[PDB]
Amino acid sequence: TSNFRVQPTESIVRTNLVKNKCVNFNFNGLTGTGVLTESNKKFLPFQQFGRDIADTTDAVRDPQTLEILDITPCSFGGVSVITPGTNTSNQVAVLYQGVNCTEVNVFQTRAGCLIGAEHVNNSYECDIPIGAGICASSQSIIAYTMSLGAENSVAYSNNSIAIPTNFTISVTTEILPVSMTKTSV
Amino acid sequence: GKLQDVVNQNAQALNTLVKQLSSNFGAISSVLNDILSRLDPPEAEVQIDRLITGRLQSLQTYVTQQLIRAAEIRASANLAATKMSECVLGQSKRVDFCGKGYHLMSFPQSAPHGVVFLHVTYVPAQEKNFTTAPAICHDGKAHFPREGVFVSNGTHWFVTQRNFYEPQIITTDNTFVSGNCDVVIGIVNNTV
Amino acid sequence: AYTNSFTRGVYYPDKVFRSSVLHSTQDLFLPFFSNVTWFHAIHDNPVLPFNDGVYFASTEKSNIIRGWIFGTTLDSKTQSLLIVNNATNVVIKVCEFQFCNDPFLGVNCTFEYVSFKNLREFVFKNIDGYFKIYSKHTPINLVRDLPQGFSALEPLVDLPIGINITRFQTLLALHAAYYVGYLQPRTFLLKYNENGTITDAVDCALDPLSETKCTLKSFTVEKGIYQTSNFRVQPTESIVRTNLVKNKCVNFNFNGLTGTGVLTESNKKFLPFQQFGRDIADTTDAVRDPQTLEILDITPCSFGGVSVITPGTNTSNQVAVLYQGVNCTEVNVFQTRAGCLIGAEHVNNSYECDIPIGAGICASSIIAYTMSLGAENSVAYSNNSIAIPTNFTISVTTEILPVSMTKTSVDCTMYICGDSTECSNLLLQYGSFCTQLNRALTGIAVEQDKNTQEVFAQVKQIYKTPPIKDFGGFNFSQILPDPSKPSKRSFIEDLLFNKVTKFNGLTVLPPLLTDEMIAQYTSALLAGTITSGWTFGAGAALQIPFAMQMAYRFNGIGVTQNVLYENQKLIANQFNSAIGKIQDSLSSTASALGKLQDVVNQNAQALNTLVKQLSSNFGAISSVLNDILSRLDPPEAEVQIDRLITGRLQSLQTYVTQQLIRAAEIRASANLAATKMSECVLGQSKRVDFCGKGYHLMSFPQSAPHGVVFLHVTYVPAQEKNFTTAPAICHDGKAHFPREGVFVSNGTHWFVTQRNFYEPQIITTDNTFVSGNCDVVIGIVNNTV
């Protein structure tokens, strides 16, 4: 449906310094967006910033106190909606992709934060794929780890055989596209 | 749904081109008539260049996507041609190519922008349990089965084919001698 | 005199902390293994030049050389810098000084700062007149020259004086040598440690091995061919129509038109008013001249791509420099069809090709030779000569097929626009590019999940192996799963997973299936194979002992099953030995998984390329939206935001198109893997060289990073023998023919045998049928039937 985005809360003009939250920082004219938690990177006295492989600002040096504050930008993702048929129900479930549930029947999975679903601990065949192993499906939306299939143990002795005694002729339908519509512009 | 999806992607791309005709791509208007009816040529040249760049990029994108999709449909078409030749005109042995099961026939029917096969497949469905033996020793000489398996019902030993239960009596016609018993693991001692 | 300054004088380029990364820059530096002037102090300070900055290093045992004099003429007519340091006090001034004739510290002011065994390095370099100093002190034990070592330099003084310097002189102390070099605009590939300190460097424009290493962005290279640059012949002089010369690369100017080529003269049919001949793309093949009449044609200067042949850097450091499509008279020199082969020596032998050069030449001291395609053999063909094998060899072949990619989704608004509004407005003005792009990427992700499902989910019923392993004598303990691991796998699967290894809108979605599920599928397929055979893919599963299963799989390639039931111990041992060889290969060779590693490397390289494309300026004044918007007026800025939108939109369209071709490639591989699974794993194929080289027997899957691995078990025969044959036999005038197999002889007796494993029987009425007469068929021998 859309893209989930966390917003900052205040502007830091360097006023004071705050930590562990999404904030806007203004250090001698340069802006940005991230979490100004402090770190312990090596500080050679001439150096100011740290950078990764792809040349993006990670750390920063405060112009008053000599400390290094690494930056982790605000979380984001795409909101995704699980829906049954409108002839059946009108209930939904709003997944947040790759977002921990402390950032939004809240249930947390490695695919993301899933809200409008139950957590049945049984195993059925898969209906609507959520991701990373679980998939969704008396009007209660449930979420459960999918069952791959039934389980069987073949009676393998060293003198045991099975032979069929009756058959079943089957007819299978296979559909293959062959062409589009011939078009010119 | 496959053929419907092909129709839907083609119609969606064709509609998308018309929506980009309705787009603007940075100019002050989306129509050459209102561009030319008011503006002088030294500025109309720049604006029409903007529209040309936009629509030419759009049409190039459309043709590239058609080329990739046509490659996809060409792969499907060659697969359909091969499958016609092997399944329709003959009896294949490549398993799970002409349908799940031991395939034995096929029939085509036409369909919008495609083909439909009706794969007729033998399947077995009702099973039992029996006791086997890799060979059978009678006079110290091992006998082996030509085609099929060796089975028993607790008291007598029978030979049948591998794929439909129909047992016969052990005679010289269905078993051949291949030497000595002592090398083969699993030998039993019934009469041949 | 003069001496060799090996590596010293490398400083810190900028003030950005970096760790565990190789970085390339471009600025002035002292080159590597060059000549730097060496001085003395006994029994020495003239006015040395100041070209572009000085690497100065005074090895001190007594602290004599202490200060410097900077300026243009040293005579109090410009602002001259004077630095004095009596080992405690640092003095810097910008006054005007009337210096001495041979100045040494014997034993208009606007700025002032006041604070053998050793070595004291410097870089007195200047940018825009802004005087900069680097320094580093270190203790040594040396008496003669500079030590052979590496030491990074950090900036101590940065002075905004804006002074153009031409002359500088040191300062003695009369009651320790020093060196002066110069800087060149090279490029370097540095190496930081985890503490942010430079550990090594590579001078890019020194030798072809350094060019190759600077291109590959690494210090250790592999054996192969790596294109380094483009060879280009330069002209020498300009012809203005003065005089005219031929057979040379020259510049020619004729009434205002320029060019580059060879002005050799020819016999083009001039028609009395014509001037030029012309090629297609507005390039003149021929030309005439205004001072006289003469027709002369044009041929441009030769060019090509400089290619470098390099062996393993853990074996040698000598190279070879191939020039492509260039004759060796315009570059031990060797000439071949691919081009000039400066570096290696021609050899008149032929071996297996190692490093392919082109047109039949393969490189490998370093030799060059025409490749030997293979060994030679003359088959002893006759009209009564046959060969039957007498002993076989079970083989196990490893085949690796990529099946899946990594799902990705890149939103246009966050990519092109960084948290902006004017950018979003203009990107809405450009249309539906975003929706079509995300639709394409979502289609890629969905079809990758479909690829994985189609390859693996083909059983629909998980089977389990019995606790008792009575499998005839075979041993599947290394492929069967291991319950001891926290994530259940097997030994070979763990070895395979052991080998293969942001915040701009780029996200990575996980696969729907997990590795435990894919391993559950693989173990279900394998347990179904072992305990049932081919039957579990048609309908339901069956029970068959494993000896019986392999006996029927010999009858599926022509060999009678009593071979198995009399050789099963040998076949079991040789299968187990082949399994152990698979372990040894997968534990001591890394080149096997190159397909999957290449897929991972191309995907990561494309993503990284897109992220570095975020930094490209694309024609504007800056590469950051925040600093674009923080300065420019709203009428001014929108052109520059449009330029960046065009650049990143083109980049993202290129990325998605390349993703589309690559996804088509992976899809073809995935369908091929699905067909392999069905035909090879669930059954016994007869398509030659599809399920392994030789007569195919079985196959076993194992999971792998974004792929699958097959272990094709294959019969191969190995030990031949020569016999004498005959198309038929006549006994009572009636021709006898063989039902199955060849009809052979040792030299005294005639026997009938199987076509594919030597085991002869006695000729009776039960293995030969009567058909025809003697006369029509060529080759009948006479023997009792």
From Swiss-Prot, chain C:
Outcome when changing N438K: In strain: Omicron/BA.1, Omicron/BA.2, Omicron/BA.2.12.1, Omicron/BA.2.75, Omicron/BA.4, Omicron/BA.5, Omicron/BQ.1.1, Omicron/XBB.1.5, Omicron/EG.5.1
Outcome after substituting Q324H: In strain: A23.1
Extracellular side: 1-785
GO biological process, one term: symbiont-mediated-mediated suppression of host tetherin activity
Record region (Putative superantigen): 193-214
Consequence the record notes for mutating E740K: In strain: Theta/P.3
Broad class of the protein's primary localization: virion
Ranges in coiled-coil conformation: 597-641
Disulfide bond entries: C95-C109, C204-C214, C249-C301, C328-C340, C353-C362, C412-C434, C417-C423, C680-C691, C730-C774
Effect of Q602H: In strain: Omicron/BA.1, Omicron/BA.2, Omicron/BA.2.12.1, Omicron/BA.2.75, Omicron/BA.4, Omicron/BA.5, Omicron/BQ.1.1, Omicron/XBB.1.5, Omicron/EG.5.1
Glycan-carrying positions: 35, 86, 108, 164, 195, 236, 238, 314, 327, 348, 383, 391, 475, 722, 746, 782
Outcome (variant: T59I): In strain: Iota/B.1.526, Mu/B.1.621, B.1.1.318, Omicron/BA.1
Effect of V47A: In strain: Omicron/XBB.1.5, Omicron/EG.5.1
Tagged with keyword Membrane: yes
InterPro entries noted in UniProt: bCoV_S1_N, BETA_CORONA_SPIKE, CoV_S1_C, S2_sf_CoV, Spike_N_sf, Spike_S1_N_SARS-CoV-like, Spike_S1_RBD_bCoV, Spike_S1_RBD_SARS-CoV-2
Stored Gene3D superfamilies: 1.20.5.300, 3.30.70.1840, Single helix bin, Spike glycoprotein, N-terminal domain
Effect after changing T675I: In strain: Gamma/P.1
Effect of F536L: In strain: Eta/B.1.525
Site (Cleavage): residue numbering on this chain: R489, S490
Effect ascribed to mutating S630A: In strain: Alpha/B.1.1.7
The UniProt record lists the keyword Transmembrane: yes
Effect of A41V: In strain: Eta/B.1.525, Omicron/BA.1
Family the UniProt entry places it in: Belongs to the betacoronaviruses spike protein family.
Additional detail: Variant D614G has become the most prevalent circulating sequence in the global pandemic since April 2020. The mutation is associated with higher viral loads produced in cell culture and animal models. It would not change pathogenicity nor neutralization properties vs vaccination. May be prevalent because the mutation increases virus transmission in human population.
Name of the protein this chain belongs to: Spike glycoprotein
Lineage: Viruses, Riboviria, Orthornavirae, Pisuviricota, Pisoniviricetes
Designated gene of the protein: S
